[PDB]
């Protein structure tokens, strides 16, 4: 359970993201795909992209980055009271998209890196720890839904 002070640190940096949701989503997906190429393989939509320049030039990738970060922002702004938002996401990622929990760890690392690059003055260690806790809570709660459905592994 995050404290109120931890949530404030999380949402204070997240308010900085929402000024350029699409730029952040591009940086985060690109980092994810470069760092963990098995992730790119889960998107039939993106698997033709073979270079970082092609990734940066894809408008469809930029659109998906906004989809991802819009859903994550709505979950973070619930400060843990996020059951209604996670249900459908856990269900589609477990049963349709077939995304292992481990890849949610990977995208959490990319999010943290990109926030540190773009917002260092609002993403010192206290805020990095709080955002780590928030993303761990996200993963923990998705993992319990996966386990229900037979996908925790
Ligand atoms: C912060 C974590 C993530 C969030 C908030 C998120 C959110 C979403 C949303 C809102 C959609 C569209 C609606 C739906 O299908 O449920 C989507 C689709 C999808 N996601 Fe995620 N996602 C996350 C992580 C991942 C990761 C790590 C992968 C793969 C490695 C992934 C793979 C996919 C795929 C394959 C689709 C369908 C894309 C398409 O072909 O249109 N997601 N995601």
JSON list of C-alpha atoms and ligand atoms in Angstrom, two decimals:
[
{"chain": "A", "resi": 1, "resn": "UNK", "atom": "CA", "xyz": [0.00, 0.00, 0.00]},
{"chain": "A", "resi": 2, "resn": "UNK", "atom": "CA", "xyz": [1.50, 3.34, -1.02]},
{"chain": "A", "resi": 3, "resn": "UNK", "atom": "CA", "xyz": [1.22, 6.21, 1.45]},
{"chain": "A", "resi": 4, "resn": "UNK", "atom": "CA", "xyz": [-0.43, 9.45, 0.50]},
{"chain": "A", "resi": 5, "resn": "UNK", "atom": "CA", "xyz": [2.94, 11.09, 0.30]},
{"chain": "A", "resi": 6, "resn": "UNK", "atom": "CA", "xyz": [4.18, 8.38, -2.11]},
{"chain": "A", "resi": 7, "resn": "UNK", "atom": "CA", "xyz": [1.09, 8.87, -4.31]},
{"chain": "A", "resi": 8, "resn": "UNK", "atom": "CA", "xyz": [1.73, 12.60, -4.38]},
{"chain": "A", "resi": 9, "resn": "UNK", "atom": "CA", "xyz": [5.22, 12.03, -5.71]},
{"chain": "A", "resi": 10, "resn": "UNK", "atom": "CA", "xyz": [3.85, 9.64, -8.35]},
{"chain": "A", "resi": 11, "resn": "UNK", "atom": "CA", "xyz": [1.10, 11.97, -9.53]},
{"chain": "A", "resi": 12, "resn": "UNK", "atom": "CA", "xyz": [3.31, 15.03, -9.42]},
{"chain": "A", "resi": 13, "resn": "UNK", "atom": "CA", "xyz": [5.62, 13.53, -12.06]},
{"chain": "A", "resi": 14, "resn": "UNK", "atom": "CA", "xyz": [2.74, 12.02, -13.93]},
{"chain": "A", "resi": 15, "resn": "UNK", "atom": "CA", "xyz": [1.20, 15.51, -14.36]},
{"chain": "A", "resi": 16, "resn": "UNK", "atom": "CA", "xyz": [4.47, 16.39, -16.21]},
{"chain": "A", "resi": 17, "resn": "UNK", "atom": "CA", "xyz": [3.91, 13.45, -18.57]},
{"chain": "A", "resi": 18, "resn": "UNK", "atom": "CA", "xyz": [0.49, 14.51, -19.57]},
{"chain": "A", "resi": 19, "resn": "UNK", "atom": "CA", "xyz": [1.98, 17.59, -21.27]},
{"chain": "A", "resi": 20, "resn": "UNK", "atom": "CA", "xyz": [3.44, 15.34, -23.97]},
{"chain": "A", "resi": 21, "resn": "UNK", "atom": "CA", "xyz": [1.77, 12.00, -23.64]},
{"chain": "A", "resi": 22, "resn": "UNK", "atom": "CA", "xyz": [2.68, 10.93, -27.22]},
{"chain": "A", "resi": 23, "resn": "UNK", "atom": "CA", "xyz": [6.41, 11.73, -26.88]},
{"chain": "A", "resi": 24, "resn": "UNK", "atom": "CA", "xyz": [6.65, 9.80, -23.70]},
{"chain": "A", "resi": 25, "resn": "UNK", "atom": "CA", "xyz": [4.78, 6.85, -25.18]},
{"chain": "A", "resi": 26, "resn": "UNK", "atom": "CA", "xyz": [7.19, 6.70, -28.13]},
{"chain": "A", "resi": 27, "resn": "UNK", "atom": "CA", "xyz": [10.26, 6.84, -25.90]},
{"chain": "A", "resi": 28, "resn": "UNK", "atom": "CA", "xyz": [8.84, 4.19, -23.59]},
{"chain": "A", "resi": 29, "resn": "UNK", "atom": "CA", "xyz": [7.84, 1.68, -26.31]},
{"chain": "A", "resi": 30, "resn": "UNK", "atom": "CA", "xyz": [11.05, 2.20, -28.19]},
{"chain": "A", "resi": 31, "resn": "UNK", "atom": "CA", "xyz": [13.09, 1.62, -25.04]},
{"chain": "A", "resi": 32, "resn": "UNK", "atom": "CA", "xyz": [11.03, -1.50, -24.30]},
{"chain": "A", "resi": 33, "resn": "UNK", "atom": "CA", "xyz": [11.51, -2.89, -27.80]},
{"chain": "A", "resi": 34, "resn": "UNK", "atom": "CA", "xyz": [15.26, -2.15, -27.92]},
{"chain": "A", "resi": 35, "resn": "UNK", "atom": "CA", "xyz": [15.93, -3.47, -24.43]},
{"chain": "A", "resi": 36, "resn": "UNK", "atom": "CA", "xyz": [13.74, -6.51, -24.69]},
{"chain": "A", "resi": 37, "resn": "UNK", "atom": "CA", "xyz": [13.23, -7.50, -28.33]},
{"chain": "A", "resi": 38, "resn": "UNK", "atom": "CA", "xyz": [10.97, -10.42, -27.42]},
{"chain": "A", "resi": 39, "resn": "UNK", "atom": "CA", "xyz": [8.38, -7.74, -26.52]},
{"chain": "A", "resi": 40, "resn": "UNK", "atom": "CA", "xyz": [8.27, -6.37, -30.06]},
{"chain": "A", "resi": 41, "resn": "UNK", "atom": "CA", "xyz": [7.45, -9.84, -31.26]},
{"chain": "A", "resi": 42, "resn": "UNK", "atom": "CA", "xyz": [4.09, -9.71, -29.40]},
{"chain": "A", "resi": 43, "resn": "UNK", "atom": "CA", "xyz": [2.86, -6.91, -31.68]},
{"chain": "A", "resi": 44, "resn": "UNK", "atom": "CA", "xyz": [1.96, -8.12, -35.16]},
{"chain": "A", "resi": 45, "resn": "UNK", "atom": "CA", "xyz": [1.25, -4.39, -35.67]},
{"chain": "A", "resi": 46, "resn": "UNK", "atom": "CA", "xyz": [4.97, -3.43, -35.07]},
{"chain": "A", "resi": 47, "resn": "UNK", "atom": "CA", "xyz": [7.09, -6.39, -35.79]},
{"chain": "A", "resi": 48, "resn": "UNK", "atom": "CA", "xyz": [8.07, -4.96, -39.28]},
{"chain": "A", "resi": 49, "resn": "UNK", "atom": "CA", "xyz": [10.04, -2.24, -37.47]},
{"chain": "A", "resi": 50, "resn": "UNK", "atom": "CA", "xyz": [13.73, -3.20, -37.57]},
{"chain": "A", "resi": 51, "resn": "UNK", "atom": "CA", "xyz": [15.52, 0.07, -36.57]},
{"chain": "A", "resi": 52, "resn": "UNK", "atom": "CA", "xyz": [15.04, 2.74, -34.01]},
{"chain": "A", "resi": 53, "resn": "UNK", "atom": "CA", "xyz": [14.57, 5.31, -36.81]},
{"chain": "A", "resi": 54, "resn": "UNK", "atom": "CA", "xyz": [11.71, 3.25, -38.25]},
{"chain": "A", "resi": 55, "resn": "UNK", "atom": "CA", "xyz": [10.17, 3.02, -34.81]},
{"chain": "A", "resi": 56, "resn": "UNK", "atom": "CA", "xyz": [10.41, 6.80, -34.28]},
{"chain": "A", "resi": 57, "resn": "UNK", "atom": "CA", "xyz": [8.82, 7.38, -37.71]},
{"chain": "A", "resi": 58, "resn": "UNK", "atom": "CA", "xyz": [5.82, 5.13, -37.08]},
{"chain": "A", "resi": 59, "resn": "UNK", "atom": "CA", "xyz": [2.65, 7.08, -36.42]},
{"chain": "A", "resi": 60, "resn": "UNK", "atom": "CA", "xyz": [0.83, 3.93, -35.50]},
{"chain": "A", "resi": 61, "resn": "UNK", "atom": "CA", "xyz": [3.46, 3.22, -32.76]},
{"chain": "A", "resi": 62, "resn": "UNK", "atom": "CA", "xyz": [3.02, 6.81, -31.48]},
{"chain": "A", "resi": 63, "resn": "UNK", "atom": "CA", "xyz": [-0.77, 6.25, -31.34]},
{"chain": "A", "resi": 64, "resn": "UNK", "atom": "CA", "xyz": [-0.33, 3.07, -29.36]},
{"chain": "A", "resi": 65, "resn": "UNK", "atom": "CA", "xyz": [2.00, 4.81, -26.94]},
{"chain": "A", "resi": 66, "resn": "UNK", "atom": "CA", "xyz": [-0.82, 7.27, -26.18]},
{"chain": "A", "resi": 67, "resn": "UNK", "atom": "CA", "xyz": [-3.26, 4.33, -25.70]},
{"chain": "A", "resi": 68, "resn": "UNK", "atom": "CA", "xyz": [-0.89, 2.72, -23.21]},
{"chain": "A", "resi": 69, "resn": "UNK", "atom": "CA", "xyz": [-0.07, 5.82, -21.22]},
{"chain": "A", "resi": 70, "resn": "UNK", "atom": "CA", "xyz": [-3.71, 7.00, -21.12]},
{"chain": "A", "resi": 71, "resn": "UNK", "atom": "CA", "xyz": [-4.71, 3.68, -19.55]},
{"chain": "A", "resi": 72, "resn": "UNK", "atom": "CA", "xyz": [-1.78, 3.76, -17.09]},
{"chain": "A", "resi": 73, "resn": "UNK", "atom": "CA", "xyz": [-2.53, 7.36, -16.08]},
{"chain": "A", "resi": 74, "resn": "UNK", "atom": "CA", "xyz": [-6.20, 6.52, -15.34]},
{"chain": "A", "resi": 75, "resn": "UNK", "atom": "CA", "xyz": [-4.94, 3.62, -13.12]},
{"chain": "A", "resi": 76, "resn": "UNK", "atom": "CA", "xyz": [-2.39, 5.75, -11.29]},
{"chain": "A", "resi": 77, "resn": "UNK", "atom": "CA", "xyz": [-4.91, 8.50, -10.59]},
{"chain": "A", "resi": 78, "resn": "UNK", "atom": "CA", "xyz": [-7.05, 5.86, -8.73]},
{"chain": "A", "resi": 79, "resn": "UNK", "atom": "CA", "xyz": [-4.22, 5.53, -6.18]},
{"chain": "A", "resi": 80, "resn": "UNK", "atom": "CA", "xyz": [-4.63, 1.80, -5.82]},
{"chain": "A", "resi": 81, "resn": "UNK", "atom": "CA", "xyz": [-8.43, 1.77, -6.01]},
{"chain": "A", "resi": 82, "resn": "UNK", "atom": "CA", "xyz": [-8.04, 0.60, -9.55]},
{"chain": "A", "resi": 83, "resn": "UNK", "atom": "CA", "xyz": [-9.96, -2.72, -9.72]},
{"chain": "A", "resi": 84, "resn": "UNK", "atom": "CA", "xyz": [-12.33, -1.56, -12.41]},
{"chain": "A", "resi": 85, "resn": "UNK", "atom": "CA", "xyz": [-9.55, -0.41, -14.64]},
{"chain": "A", "resi": 86, "resn": "UNK", "atom": "CA", "xyz": [-7.32, -3.42, -14.19]},
{"chain": "A", "resi": 87, "resn": "UNK", "atom": "CA", "xyz": [-9.93, -6.12, -14.81]},
{"chain": "A", "resi": 88, "resn": "UNK", "atom": "CA", "xyz": [-10.30, -5.53, -18.48]},
{"chain": "A", "resi": 89, "resn": "UNK", "atom": "CA", "xyz": [-6.60, -4.86, -19.09]},
{"chain": "A", "resi": 90, "resn": "UNK", "atom": "CA", "xyz": [-5.51, -8.01, -17.22]},
{"chain": "A", "resi": 91, "resn": "UNK", "atom": "CA", "xyz": [-8.07, -10.03, -19.10]},
{"chain": "A", "resi": 92, "resn": "UNK", "atom": "CA", "xyz": [-7.01, -8.82, -22.53]},
{"chain": "A", "resi": 93, "resn": "UNK", "atom": "CA", "xyz": [-3.27, -9.02, -21.80]},
{"chain": "A", "resi": 94, "resn": "UNK", "atom": "CA", "xyz": [-3.49, -12.50, -20.33]},
{"chain": "A", "resi": 95, "resn": "UNK", "atom": "CA", "xyz": [-5.93, -14.20, -22.69]},
{"chain": "A", "resi": 96, "resn": "UNK", "atom": "CA", "xyz": [-5.75, -12.26, -26.01]},
{"chain": "A", "resi": 97, "resn": "UNK", "atom": "CA", "xyz": [-2.38, -10.53, -26.23]},
{"chain": "A", "resi": 98, "resn": "UNK", "atom": "CA", "xyz": [-0.55, -13.26, -24.25]},
{"chain": "A", "resi": 99, "resn": "UNK", "atom": "CA", "xyz": [1.80, -10.91, -22.38]},
{"chain": "A", "resi": 100, "resn": "UNK", "atom": "CA", "xyz": [3.78, -12.46, -19.53]},
{"chain": "A", "resi": 101, "resn": "UNK", "atom": "CA", "xyz": [3.96, -10.59, -16.22]},
{"chain": "A", "resi": 102, "resn": "UNK", "atom": "CA", "xyz": [7.67, -10.38, -16.76]},
{"chain": "A", "resi": 103, "resn": "UNK", "atom": "CA", "xyz": [7.07, -8.10, -19.76]},
{"chain": "A", "resi": 104, "resn": "UNK", "atom": "CA", "xyz": [5.06, -5.79, -17.53]},
{"chain": "A", "resi": 105, "resn": "UNK", "atom": "CA", "xyz": [8.22, -5.59, -15.39]},
{"chain": "A", "resi": 106, "resn": "UNK", "atom": "CA", "xyz": [10.14, -4.66, -18.51]},
{"chain": "A", "resi": 107, "resn": "UNK", "atom": "CA", "xyz": [7.77, -1.86, -19.53]},
{"chain": "A", "resi": 108, "resn": "UNK", "atom": "CA", "xyz": [7.81, -0.61, -15.88]},
{"chain": "A", "resi": 109, "resn": "UNK", "atom": "CA", "xyz": [11.61, -0.27, -16.18]},
{"chain": "A", "resi": 110, "resn": "UNK", "atom": "CA", "xyz": [11.25, 1.63, -19.43]},
{"chain": "A", "resi": 111, "resn": "UNK", "atom": "CA", "xyz": [8.65, 4.00, -17.94]},
{"chain": "A", "resi": 112, "resn": "UNK", "atom": "CA", "xyz": [10.95, 4.75, -15.00]},
{"chain": "A", "resi": 113, "resn": "UNK", "atom": "CA", "xyz": [13.92, 5.38, -17.28]},
{"chain": "A", "resi": 114, "resn": "UNK", "atom": "CA", "xyz": [11.98, 7.75, -19.55]},
{"chain": "A", "resi": 115, "resn": "UNK", "atom": "CA", "xyz": [10.56, 9.69, -16.59]},
{"chain": "A", "resi": 116, "resn": "UNK", "atom": "CA", "xyz": [14.00, 10.11, -15.16]},
{"chain": "A", "resi": 117, "resn": "UNK", "atom": "CA", "xyz": [15.33, 11.37, -18.52]},
{"chain": "A", "resi": 118, "resn": "UNK", "atom": "CA", "xyz": [12.48, 13.83, -19.14]},
{"chain": "A", "resi": 119, "resn": "UNK", "atom": "CA", "xyz": [11.72, 15.00, -15.60]},
{"chain": "A", "resi": 120, "resn": "UNK", "atom": "CA", "xyz": [14.82, 14.80, -13.43]},
{"chain": "A", "resi": 121, "resn": "UNK", "atom": "CA", "xyz": [13.88, 17.67, -11.10]},
{"chain": "A", "resi": 122, "resn": "UNK", "atom": "CA", "xyz": [10.56, 15.89, -10.33]},
{"chain": "A", "resi": 123, "resn": "UNK", "atom": "CA", "xyz": [11.98, 12.43, -10.39]},
{"chain": "A", "resi": 124, "resn": "UNK", "atom": "CA", "xyz": [14.65, 12.25, -7.74]},
{"chain": "A", "resi": 125, "resn": "UNK", "atom": "CA", "xyz": [15.11, 9.15, -5.67]},
{"chain": "A", "resi": 126, "resn": "UNK", "atom": "CA", "xyz": [12.06, 9.63, -3.47]},
{"chain": "A", "resi": 127, "resn": "UNK", "atom": "CA", "xyz": [9.85, 9.91, -6.53]},
{"chain": "A", "resi": 128, "resn": "UNK", "atom": "CA", "xyz": [11.63, 7.05, -8.30]},
{"chain": "A", "resi": 129, "resn": "UNK", "atom": "CA", "xyz": [10.97, 4.80, -5.31]},
{"chain": "A", "resi": 130, "resn": "UNK", "atom": "CA", "xyz": [7.36, 5.84, -5.14]},
{"chain": "A", "resi": 131, "resn": "UNK", "atom": "CA", "xyz": [6.81, 5.23, -8.86]},
{"chain": "A", "resi": 132, "resn": "UNK", "atom": "CA", "xyz": [8.50, 1.87, -8.50]},
{"chain": "A", "resi": 133, "resn": "UNK", "atom": "CA", "xyz": [6.05, 1.04, -5.73]},
{"chain": "A", "resi": 134, "resn": "UNK", "atom": "CA", "xyz": [3.11, 2.21, -7.85]},
{"chain": "A", "resi": 135, "resn": "UNK", "atom": "CA", "xyz": [4.19, 0.04, -10.80]},
{"chain": "A", "resi": 136, "resn": "UNK", "atom": "CA", "xyz": [4.83, -2.89, -8.51]},
{"chain": "A", "resi": 137, "resn": "UNK", "atom": "CA", "xyz": [1.24, -2.52, -7.19]},
{"chain": "A", "resi": 138, "resn": "UNK", "atom": "CA", "xyz": [0.03, -2.49, -10.79]},
{"chain": "A", "resi": 139, "resn": "UNK", "atom": "CA", "xyz": [1.94, -5.69, -11.52]},
{"chain": "A", "resi": 140, "resn": "UNK", "atom": "CA", "xyz": [0.90, -7.41, -8.30]},
{"chain": "A", "resi": 141, "resn": "UNK", "atom": "CA", "xyz": [-2.73, -6.78, -9.00]},
{"chain": "A", "resi": 142, "resn": "UNK", "atom": "CA", "xyz": [-2.52, -7.78, -12.66]},
{"chain": "A", "resi": 143, "resn": "UNK", "atom": "CA", "xyz": [-0.62, -10.95, -11.59]},
{"chain": "A", "resi": 144, "resn": "UNK", "atom": "CA", "xyz": [-3.47, -11.97, -9.22]},
{"chain": "A", "resi": 145, "resn": "UNK", "atom": "CA", "xyz": [-5.95, -11.71, -12.12]},
{"chain": "A", "resi": 146, "resn": "UNK", "atom": "CA", "xyz": [-3.62, -13.66, -14.36]},
{"chain": "A", "resi": 147, "resn": "UNK", "atom": "CA", "xyz": [-3.35, -16.39, -11.68]},
{"chain": "A", "resi": 148, "resn": "UNK", "atom": "CA", "xyz": [-7.17, -16.54, -11.43]},
{"chain": "A", "resi": 149, "resn": "UNK", "atom": "CA", "xyz": [-7.32, -17.11, -15.19]},
{"chain": "A", "resi": 150, "resn": "UNK", "atom": "CA", "xyz": [-4.56, -19.67, -15.38]},
{"chain": "A", "resi": 151, "resn": "UNK", "atom": "CA", "xyz": [-1.79, -17.49, -16.78]},
{"chain": "A", "resi": 152, "resn": "UNK", "atom": "CA", "xyz": [0.55, -16.63, -13.94]},
{"chain": "A", "resi": 153, "resn": "UNK", "atom": "CA", "xyz": [3.04, -19.36, -15.04]},
{"chain": "B", "resi": 1, "resn": "LIG", "atom": "C1", "xyz": [1.82, -0.32, -18.55]},
{"chain": "B", "resi": 1, "resn": "LIG", "atom": "C2", "xyz": [1.49, -1.40, -19.20]},
{"chain": "B", "resi": 1, "resn": "LIG", "atom": "C3", "xyz": [0.48, -1.55, -20.27]},
{"chain": "B", "resi": 1, "resn": "LIG", "atom": "C4", "xyz": [-0.67, -0.92, -20.41]},
{"chain": "B", "resi": 1, "resn": "LIG", "atom": "C5", "xyz": [-1.31, 0.15, -19.51]},
{"chain": "B", "resi": 1, "resn": "LIG", "atom": "C6", "xyz": [-1.26, -1.37, -21.64]},
{"chain": "B", "resi": 1, "resn": "LIG", "atom": "C7", "xyz": [-2.44, -0.94, -22.20]},
{"chain": "B", "resi": 1, "resn": "LIG", "atom": "C8", "xyz": [-3.06, -1.39, -23.36]},
{"chain": "B", "resi": 1, "resn": "LIG", "atom": "C9", "xyz": [-4.33, -0.96, -23.88]},
{"chain": "B", "resi": 1, "resn": "LIG", "atom": "C10", "xyz": [-5.17, 0.11, -23.18]},
{"chain": "B", "resi": 1, "resn": "LIG", "atom": "C11", "xyz": [-4.55, -1.64, -25.02]},
{"chain": "B", "resi": 1, "resn": "LIG", "atom": "C12", "xyz": [-5.71, -1.61, -25.95]},
{"chain": "B", "resi": 1, "resn": "LIG", "atom": "C13", "xyz": [-6.92, -2.26, -25.23]},
{"chain": "B", "resi": 1, "resn": "LIG", "atom": "C14", "xyz": [-6.67, -3.71, -24.84]},
{"chain": "B", "resi": 1, "resn": "LIG", "atom": "O1", "xyz": [-6.38, -4.50, -25.75]},
{"chain": "B", "resi": 1, "resn": "LIG", "atom": "O2", "xyz": [-6.72, -4.10, -23.65]},
{"chain": "B", "resi": 1, "resn": "LIG", "atom": "C15", "xyz": [-3.39, -2.49, -25.25]},
{"chain": "B", "resi": 1, "resn": "LIG", "atom": "C16", "xyz": [-3.20, -3.37, -26.31]},
{"chain": "B", "resi": 1, "resn": "LIG", "atom": "C17", "xyz": [-2.15, -4.25, -26.54]},
{"chain": "B", "resi": 1, "resn": "LIG", "atom": "N1", "xyz": [-1.06, -4.41, -25.67]},
{"chain": "B", "resi": 1, "resn": "LIG", "atom": "FE1", "xyz": [-0.79, -3.42, -23.90]},
{"chain": "B", "resi": 1, "resn": "LIG", "atom": "N2", "xyz": [-0.43, -2.33, -22.22]},
{"chain": "B", "resi": 1, "resn": "LIG", "atom": "C18", "xyz": [0.66, -2.45, -21.38]},
{"chain": "B", "resi": 1, "resn": "LIG", "atom": "C19", "xyz": [1.72, -3.29, -21.57]},
{"chain": "B", "resi": 1, "resn": "LIG", "atom": "C20", "xyz": [1.94, -4.17, -22.64]},
{"chain": "B", "resi": 1, "resn": "LIG", "atom": "C21", "xyz": [3.14, -4.93, -22.91]},
{"chain": "B", "resi": 1, "resn": "LIG", "atom": "C22", "xyz": [4.36, -4.95, -22.02]},
{"chain": "B", "resi": 1, "resn": "LIG", "atom": "C23", "xyz": [2.89, -5.55, -24.08]},
{"chain": "B", "resi": 1, "resn": "LIG", "atom": "C24", "xyz": [3.79, -6.46, -24.91]},
{"chain": "B", "resi": 1, "resn": "LIG", "atom": "C25", "xyz": [5.02, -6.78, -24.68]},
{"chain": "B", "resi": 1, "resn": "LIG", "atom": "C26", "xyz": [1.61, -5.24, -24.55]},
{"chain": "B", "resi": 1, "resn": "LIG", "atom": "C27", "xyz": [0.99, -5.70, -25.66]},
{"chain": "B", "resi": 1, "resn": "LIG", "atom": "C28", "xyz": [-0.19, -5.32, -26.21]},
{"chain": "B", "resi": 1, "resn": "LIG", "atom": "C29", "xyz": [-0.73, -5.79, -27.48]},
{"chain": "B", "resi": 1, "resn": "LIG", "atom": "C30", "xyz": [-0.13, -6.80, -28.38]},
{"chain": "B", "resi": 1, "resn": "LIG", "atom": "C31", "xyz": [-1.95, -5.05, -27.72]},
{"chain": "B", "resi": 1, "resn": "LIG", "atom": "C32", "xyz": [-2.84, -5.10, -28.94]},
{"chain": "B", "resi": 1, "resn": "LIG", "atom": "C33", "xyz": [-2.14, -4.09, -29.90]},
{"chain": "B", "resi": 1, "resn": "LIG", "atom": "C34", "xyz": [-2.78, -4.12, -31.24]},
{"chain": "B", "resi": 1, "resn": "LIG", "atom": "O3", "xyz": [-2.45, -5.06, -32.08]},
{"chain": "B", "resi": 1, "resn": "LIG", "atom": "O4", "xyz": [-3.64, -3.20, -31.41]},
{"chain": "B", "resi": 1, "resn": "LIG", "atom": "N3", "xyz": [1.00, -4.37, -23.65]},
{"chain": "B", "resi": 1, "resn": "LIG", "atom": "N4", "xyz": [-2.49, -2.35, -24.19]}
]
